[PDB]
Ligand binder design. Sequence first.
Ligand SMILES: [Zn+2]
Length: 493
Amino acid sequence: EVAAMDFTDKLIISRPLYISDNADPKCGYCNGKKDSSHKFASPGWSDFYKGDEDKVELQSSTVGFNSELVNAETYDKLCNLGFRRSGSFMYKTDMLRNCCRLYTIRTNEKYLTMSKELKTSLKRFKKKITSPEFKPQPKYVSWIDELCDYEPKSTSFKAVFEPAEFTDEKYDLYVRYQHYIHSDEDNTPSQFESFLCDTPFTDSEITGTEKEWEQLNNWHNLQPGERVTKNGPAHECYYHNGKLIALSVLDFLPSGVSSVYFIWDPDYYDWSLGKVSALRELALVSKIGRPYYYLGYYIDDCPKMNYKAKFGGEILDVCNQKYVPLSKIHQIIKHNELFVGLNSTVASPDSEILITSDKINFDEPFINAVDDIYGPNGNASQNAITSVAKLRKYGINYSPDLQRSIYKEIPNKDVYRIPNVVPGLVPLMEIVSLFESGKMNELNNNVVLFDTKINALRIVRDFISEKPEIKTVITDVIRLIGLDNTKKAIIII
Ligand SMILES: [Zn+2]
């Protein structure tokens, strides 16, 4: 006998897509409009195009895959690889080629600086919901403890955690909010359902139990060292005298909480709910004893996204697979640069950084090595073209990227084709090593396919003998999520 397939431990995904189009209009953050000093990924590319910035057509570019099943531990890993979910679609930008530089940001109460601005938003909230008879304690150790004292005592305000389920009330509020912010989307009931209610998580992570939701809704009273069992998606409903005035869509992960989406009643602009809800969610992360609050993507030059910097924290270096505090690099990403860290005591990189050895230490001095690796005279492309040829010998249908520039120039597409060189994907030279060391044989008896032809699941038994189209899809999944995660995948082909 062999153990039944355990779908509490599987990631079911479609084959990867690489979607690239003109940033005007595809990019909702910049609309393809950038100052020429923000237009490129590095000073080396800025200088390569100095004087002809107007002959590049910026592109908006995403790579990812649809998910039919993911558990919270696996989604946590994907967040910490630089992915985000949009409904059930797991994606990231191509940070080398995209118009805007999107960084994965995370923070917590240790990073947070309670500025006058943030303090004012909490003070207003307290005044909106708190009776004049409330008597505060003479001292609160943290602003979190102050909030956890008065908020549950309000007779007019109540926030409720519940499963992420459609209601007419929620949808009507979303329509009004999306119109107030000038969403250029349909915003039909089905779209709201797929975006913010239906998810690829396990049923236990979606539905939970009555005890789990009651425990979560008691969070204001959690004591030090106490924890909650909840993982997976949730809605937090904000009620003022029985009326829904805001809805927070959140994912509970082993390492903390991710903010999916926040909507509020435009008539409540004077409650500062955008800032208040972020502070409440930071307080929640602290009270449930988890380390990080994830606000999604940070774009230093987009006002709709750089508000996240006010809560502090650290930014993911996808090339090193480590976080660096925002305060240490903010000055060198202010012109939409891509950052690739390298300790100053380390020789100039001869290649893309190996996602295998001696990790970067951001507590030691470091520099941005982006142009050594990915600049117009960097080494990444030379190494990738040589790897493509070796990989073709294993039946991997990759083609070499031979163009001089990573940018689209005025002259004066296969959605299954990923570029040879993408920051944060496994470099092709490392993919070669996996084949040459036999580490790719770890896929045998582990990775599973859903063959749409025969309409059945099939465990892969001899990877190298699979058809090239199949081997190529699997290898692209490895580039995106790594070998260990792919070994727990069911890939739909
Ligand atoms: Zn953009």
